[PDB]
Amino acid sequence: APNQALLRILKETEFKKIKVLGSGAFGTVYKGLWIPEGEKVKIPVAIKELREATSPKANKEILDEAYVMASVDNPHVCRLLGICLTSTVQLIMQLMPFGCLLDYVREHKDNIGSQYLLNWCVQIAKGMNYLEDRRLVHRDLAARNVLVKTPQHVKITDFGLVPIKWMALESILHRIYTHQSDVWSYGVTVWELMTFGSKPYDGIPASEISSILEKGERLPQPPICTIDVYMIMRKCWMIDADSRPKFRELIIEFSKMARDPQRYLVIQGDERMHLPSPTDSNFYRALMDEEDMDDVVDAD
Amino acid sequence: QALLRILKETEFKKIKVLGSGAFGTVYKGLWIPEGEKVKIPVAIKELREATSPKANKEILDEAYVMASVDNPHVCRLLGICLTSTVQLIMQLMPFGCLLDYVREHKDNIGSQYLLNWCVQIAKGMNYLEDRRLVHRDLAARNVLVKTPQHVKITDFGLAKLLKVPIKWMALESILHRIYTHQSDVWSYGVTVWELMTFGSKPYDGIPASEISSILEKGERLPQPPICTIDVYMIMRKCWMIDADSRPKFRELIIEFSKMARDPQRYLVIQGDERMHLPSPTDSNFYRALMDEEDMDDVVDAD
Ligand SMILES: Nc1ncnc2c1ncn2[C@@H]1O[C@H](COP(=O)(O)OP(=O)(O)NP(=O)(O)O)[C@@H](O)[C@H]1O
Ligand SMILES: Nc1ncnc2c1ncn2[C@@H]1O[C@H](COP(=O)(O)OP(=O)(O)NP(=O)(O)O)[C@@H](O)[C@H]1O
Ligand SMILES: O=C(Nc1nccs1)[C@@H](c1ccccc1)N1Cc2ccccc2C1=O
Ligand SMILES: [Mg+2]
Ligand SMILES: [Mg+2]
Numbered sequence: 001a002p003n004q005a006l007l008r009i010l011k012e013t014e015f016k017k018i019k020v021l022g023s024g025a026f027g028t029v030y031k032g033l034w035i036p037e038g039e040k041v042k043i044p045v046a047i048k049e050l051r052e053a054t055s056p057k058a059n060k061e062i063l064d065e066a067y068v069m070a071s072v073d074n075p076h077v078c079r080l081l082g083i084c085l086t087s088t089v090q091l092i093m094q095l096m097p098f099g100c101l102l103d104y105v106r107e108h109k110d111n112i113g114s115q116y117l118l119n120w121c122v123q124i125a126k127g128m129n130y131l132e133d134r135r136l137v138h139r140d141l142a143a144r145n146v147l148v149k150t151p152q153h154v155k156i157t158d159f160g161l162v163p164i165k166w167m168a169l170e171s172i173l174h175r176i177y178t179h180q181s182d183v184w185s186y187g188v189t190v191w192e193l194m195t196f197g198s199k200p201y202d203g204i205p206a207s208e209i210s211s212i213l214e215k216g217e218r219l220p221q222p223p224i225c226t227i228d229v230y231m232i233m234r235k236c237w238m239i240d241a242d243s244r245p246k247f248r249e250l251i252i253e254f255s256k257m258a259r260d261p262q263r264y265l266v267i268q269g270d271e272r273m274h275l276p277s278p279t280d281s282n283f284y285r286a287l288m289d290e291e292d293m294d295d296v297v298d299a300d
Numbered sequence: 301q302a303l304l305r306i307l308k309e310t311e312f313k314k315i316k317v318l319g320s321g322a323f324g325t326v327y328k329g330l331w332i333p334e335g336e337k338v339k340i341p342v343a344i345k346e347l348r349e350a351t352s353p354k355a356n357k358e359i360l361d362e363a364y365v366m367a368s369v370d371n372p373h374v375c376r377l378l379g380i381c382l383t384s385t386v387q388l389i390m391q392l393m394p395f396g397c398l399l400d401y402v403r404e405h406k407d408n409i410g411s412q413y414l415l416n417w418c419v420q421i422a423k424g425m426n427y428l429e430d431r432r433l434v435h436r437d438l439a440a441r442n443v444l445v446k447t448p449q450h451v452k453i454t455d456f457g458l459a460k461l462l463k464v465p466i467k468w469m470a471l472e473s474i475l476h477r478i479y480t481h482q483s484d485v486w487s488y489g490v491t492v493w494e495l496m497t498f499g500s501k502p503y504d505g506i507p508a509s510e511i512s513s514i515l516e517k518g519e520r521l522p523q524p525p526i527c528t529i530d531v532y533m534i535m536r537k538c539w540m541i542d543a544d545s546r547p548k549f550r551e552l553i554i555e556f557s558k559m560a561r562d563p564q565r566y567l568v569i570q571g572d573e574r575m576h577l578p579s580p581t582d583s584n585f586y587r588a589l590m591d592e593e594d595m596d597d598v599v600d601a602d
Pocket of ligand 4: 145
């Protein structure tokens with residue numbers, strides 16, 4: 001039973017859209033402003049407007065999901081904050097000024113250190129492991145669905161509710177979605193990071209992806225990945241869903257790797273790239289990230 | 301140590317003036333982290349008088365203390381920039397100071413908000429006392445609104461870093477510039493008075509030079525129309541000539557907490573029934589958007 005107090009019902013008068021941030025299969029994301037009743041302040045939020053207008057009875061099913069998505073509580077998962085049931089439904093969550101991780105790593109190619117990359121792999125695995133523990137399946141994990149709270153803190157979004165090149169073969173062939181097909185997409189998500197945001201299977205029609213996968217072909221080793229990192233990615237893309245790693249294991253493996261980061265990723269000038277000092281880390285949190293969180297795995 | 305960030309002029313920029321006081325000017329600002337493209341809103345206080353390189357060592361010693369203050373009801377210094385001026389960086393509070401907030405919501409604030417504000421301010425002041433720090437400039441203008449449910453004392457120590465708030469000051473502070481936790485308690489009483497009157501000016505139109513003589517005559521700020529006698533009694537006890545005869549912040553937490561539990565027994569406010577602490581729903585929203593900080597549960601009515 002989801003605590004429905006966690007899902008605020010918004011009135012259309014309480015908020016305004018002010019900028020488009022992007023779009024995807026299900027809707028259009030806006031940066032918006034929430035103006036609390038009787039106050040003078042404008043509070044930035046992110047708003048997703050769904051693609052299709054809905055009936056009151058369809059709105060019921062949307063509301064049931066919304067109650068569930070408002071109920072998650074983990075430092076590496078975003079929760080839904082509110083909902084507006086206009087003709088076409090609008091959804092409100094926290095605005096991330098750093099955007100999604102996909103855009104972040106593209107803007108910082110190739111000037112992201114190994115420490116950051118491997119730590120993001122841990123945080124995304126923790127977030128996913130939590131979803132598994134709540135018995136939620138993501139169905140759409142990708143770098144565009146990992147949000148950057150601060151560069152040291154990423155959070156999974158848009159879970160629980162096609163992107164062929166992120167999908168496990170059984171999902172492509174049978175529309176089966178499990179925690180283990182989420183693990184496949186984890187693999188692709190890790191590939192996106194390690195390539196600083198390249199497009200998976202670029203140039204290949206979605207049409208042919210299932211065929212290519214059956215031939216045993218896969219995304220290529222990114223040039224910064226040592227063979228153990230690559231091996232992990234390949235294990236995520238095994239035909240047999242049960243042979244793939246569990247998110248629990250992925251937390252452990254990547255945490256180990258984060259302890260000796262230059263041993264597992266090879267990045268030119270890695271020595272010189274920023275590893276966040278305590279001073280910088282504390283500033284970011286005091287400024288824009290006060291939530292309770294874990295400690296980041298640092299190099300021994 | 302690692303609590304005070306030293307910034308360079310290149311990574312921040314002042315935008316708009318928010319206000320000025322005795323020691324400097326406050327700006328709505330932007331923090332532009334090196335190599336990032338995001339602009340993070342901050343507040344910047346530039347002190348009035350330029351700095352020596354030797355007066356820099358003084359400022360930093362104190363800044364490091366201000367950055368060490370970790371409590372949900374006190375603001376900490378986040379960063380500093382030392383040029384010809386001294387610039388101090390802290391979290392921007394969009395809601396502004398408590399003084400402004402009570403004026404703007406004048407007569408539309410419930411007893412539960414007012415009494416809980418008194419609890420929170422008392423907790424934050426008690427924390428400074430436990431750390432052996434004196435504020436020296438407590439007033440409603442130096443309490444900030446994080447959300448309407450969450451207020452935080454600001455600008456402590458800044459008075460030690462360097463026009464005189466006579467009408468907030470204890471008598472021994474006026475006459476001898478003695479500042480103690482017990483002189484902070486005097487100012488706390490004044491602060492509470494500011495809130496209970498929805499932001500009236502204390503001793504309005506009475507010359508500052510006359511204040512010490514007024515106080516010596518046993519005269520004090522008047523009972524706000526919404527305060528019952530027990531609440532006015534606490535305030536009057538904060539303004540006792542004998543400092544050790546004033547309440548301790550510790551006690552003030554206990555008293556106002558007691559009162560927040562039965563708020564209509566202690567404040568008489570017209571329309572108070574249609575004003576209430578936020579639903580959990582509404583409180584959840586506010587916290588997710590504005591206040592991820594941990595903080596004690598707000599005292600609710602029995
Ligand atoms: N809370 C948010 N804060 C800041 N930016 C966001 C937020 N949510 C989404 N965005 C950005 O808006 C874009 C569109 O989001 P979305 O509508 O969910 O499509 P997508 O996830 O990128 N692709 P799809 O998998 O088809 O849904 C995202 O890629 C982000 O760049
Ligand atoms: N972090 C902050 N966020 C938003 N507004 C602030 C902040 N700090 C101060 N202000 C406002 O900036 C203005 C100036 O504050 P300040 O320079 O400290 O003088 P003052 O507190 O009003 N009087 P005093 O400090 O006692 O001399 C006031 O309007 C404050 O409400
Ligand atoms: O709202 C979400 N994304 C946003 N991006 C910007 C503003 S909102 C997303 C989400 C899922 C899980 C956690 C947080 C958000 N939802 C919720 C939800 C409830 C009912 C029906 C569809 C959706 C949906 O897509
Ligand atoms: Mg998305
Ligand atoms: Mg001030």
